[PDB]
Design an enzyme around this catalytic site. Structure first.
Site, PDB file in Angstrom:
ATOM      1  N   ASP A   1     -43.657  -4.853 -21.029  1.00 21.79           N
ATOM      2  CA  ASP A   1     -44.540  -5.544 -20.094  1.00 21.79           C
ATOM      3  C   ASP A   1     -45.454  -6.516 -20.841  1.00 21.79           C
ATOM      4  O   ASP A   1     -45.043  -7.098 -21.859  1.00 21.79           O
ATOM      5  CB  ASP A   1     -45.326  -4.502 -19.276  1.00 21.79           C
ATOM      6  CG  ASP A   1     -45.675  -4.986 -17.881  1.00 21.79           C
ATOM      7  OD1 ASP A   1     -46.553  -5.869 -17.764  1.00 21.79           O
ATOM      8  OD2 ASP A   1     -45.090  -4.466 -16.901  1.00 21.79           O
TER       9      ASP A   1
ATOM     10  N   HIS B   1     -51.546  -6.380 -16.191  1.00 23.57           N
ATOM     11  CA  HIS B   1     -50.382  -5.808 -15.513  1.00 23.57           C
ATOM     12  C   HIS B   1     -49.786  -4.634 -16.293  1.00 23.57           C
ATOM     13  O   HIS B   1     -49.539  -3.559 -15.726  1.00 23.57           O
ATOM     14  CB  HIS B   1     -49.367  -6.935 -15.283  1.00 23.57           C
ATOM     15  CG  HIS B   1     -48.143  -6.548 -14.513  1.00 23.57           C
ATOM     16  ND1 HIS B   1     -46.998  -6.087 -15.128  1.00 23.57           N
ATOM     17  CD2 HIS B   1     -47.850  -6.638 -13.192  1.00 23.57           C
ATOM     18  CE1 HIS B   1     -46.063  -5.884 -14.216  1.00 23.57           C
ATOM     19  NE2 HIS B   1     -46.553  -6.211 -13.035  1.00 23.57           N
TER      20      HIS B   1
ATOM     21  N   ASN C   1     -40.032  -8.204  -5.536  1.00 21.37           N
ATOM     22  CA  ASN C   1     -41.035  -8.364  -4.487  1.00 21.37           C
ATOM     23  C   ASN C   1     -40.716  -9.512  -3.533  1.00 21.37           C
ATOM     24  O   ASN C   1     -41.619 -10.185  -3.025  1.00 21.37           O
ATOM     25  CB  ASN C   1     -42.428  -8.573  -5.074  1.00 21.37           C
ATOM     26  CG  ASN C   1     -42.835  -7.476  -6.022  1.00 21.37           C
ATOM     27  OD1 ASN C   1     -42.522  -6.305  -5.808  1.00 21.37           O
ATOM     28  ND2 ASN C   1     -43.572  -7.843  -7.064  1.00 21.37           N
TER      29      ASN C   1
ATOM     30  N   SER D   1     -43.648  -3.366  -9.101  1.00 18.90           N
ATOM     31  CA  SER D   1     -44.139  -3.088 -10.448  1.00 18.90           C
ATOM     32  C   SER D   1     -44.961  -1.812 -10.496  1.00 18.90           C
ATOM     33  O   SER D   1     -45.079  -1.201 -11.560  1.00 18.90           O
ATOM     34  CB  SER D   1     -45.053  -4.210 -10.930  1.00 18.90           C
ATOM     35  OG  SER D   1     -44.320  -5.347 -11.331  1.00 18.90           O
TER      36      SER D   1
END
Length: 279
Positions: A39, A69, A161, A224
């Site tokens: 990530d 994130h 998404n 996520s």
């Protein structure tokens, strides 16, 4: 063990019903397992990680998470308050820059890195990788995820998404990894969650409270956020000896809450991750 006033998603993964707020789990808590968070990095100094998180690789000028994130996702895997597997070891691999973007070549290198690097770590209960990232279909990206899984790592990836069929996204569309859709606190498919036959499981993904950079916390939404619920659950179940890296996605599907989600398109699994913990 019982954690009162837990984030709704933790309570959901240990419950046969929505609408409760206590998380129940075996006190082994993923001890002896390892989860790689591939990530934007992890703010390992966050008190919520208790010294159990560390950066092991970056492809950029810093290994620090300048975005948040990756820290949020790592918190859902394994932070003391916000995490599923509260005693796992967390390893950060920074394939995404501080704007949250990364080239597929870097992402592929990061997956092959984890497949090798686990041999430098002590993970007697097993190894998981959480990939809250993706883009358009790429056979090379899917192949890298398949290699990582084949090497003995439970790979959990975000469905995406786009409110679209995940067959057109990578690594979501790789059949051999665990592709995770998102649900909300009322057991509805999250409005943005991708769907399709390639999904294996749903996890909590709307309004998920977790760690953030600057030693903070916040609530955000996405596939996520659902992915690290499943990654942490795998680590927890592997520590319990109930499953292995090669079989954990199937085991999670076998033991999921079934038929309880709304707005699941015909042909997509109606399965919600569940730890089956009996206190």
């Amino acid at each position: 063990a019982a954690q009162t006033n837990a984030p709704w998603g933790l309570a959901r993964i240990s419950s046969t019903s929505p609408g409760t707020s206590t998380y129940y789990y075996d006190e082994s808590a993923g001890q002896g397992s390892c989860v790689y968070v591939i990530d934007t990095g992890i703010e390992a100094s966050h008190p919520e990680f208790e010294g159990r998180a560390q950066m092991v690789k970056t492809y950029y000028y810093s290994s620090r998470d300048g975005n948040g994130h990756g820290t949020h996702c790592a918190g859902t895997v394994g932070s003391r308050t916000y995490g599923v597997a509260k005693k796992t070891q967390l390893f950060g691999v920074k394939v995404l820059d501080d704007n949250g973007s990364g080239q597929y070549s870097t992402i592929i290198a990061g997956m092959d890195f984890v497949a090798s690097d686990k041999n430098n770590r002590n993970c007697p209960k097993g190894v998981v990788a959480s990939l809250s990232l993706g883009g358009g279909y790429s056979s090379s990206v899917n192949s890298a995820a398949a290699r990582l899984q084949s090497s003995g790592v439970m790979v959990a990836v975000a469905a995406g998404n786009n409110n679209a069929d995940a067959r057109n996204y990578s690594p979501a569309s790789e059949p051999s990894v665990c592709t995770v859709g998102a649900s909300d606190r009322y057991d509805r498919r999250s409005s943005f969650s991708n769907y399709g036959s390639v999904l294996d499981i749903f996890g909590p993904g709307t309004d998920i409270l977790s760690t953030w950079i600057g030693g903070s916390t916040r609530s955000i939404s996405g596939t996520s956020m659902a992915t690290p619920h499943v990654a942490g659950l795998a680590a927890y179940l592997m520590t319990l000896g109930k499953t292995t890296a090669a079989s954990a996605c199937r085991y999670i599907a076998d033991t999921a809450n079934k038929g309880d989600l709304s707005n699941i398109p015909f042909g997509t699994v109606n399965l919600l991750a569940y730890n089956n913990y009996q206190a």
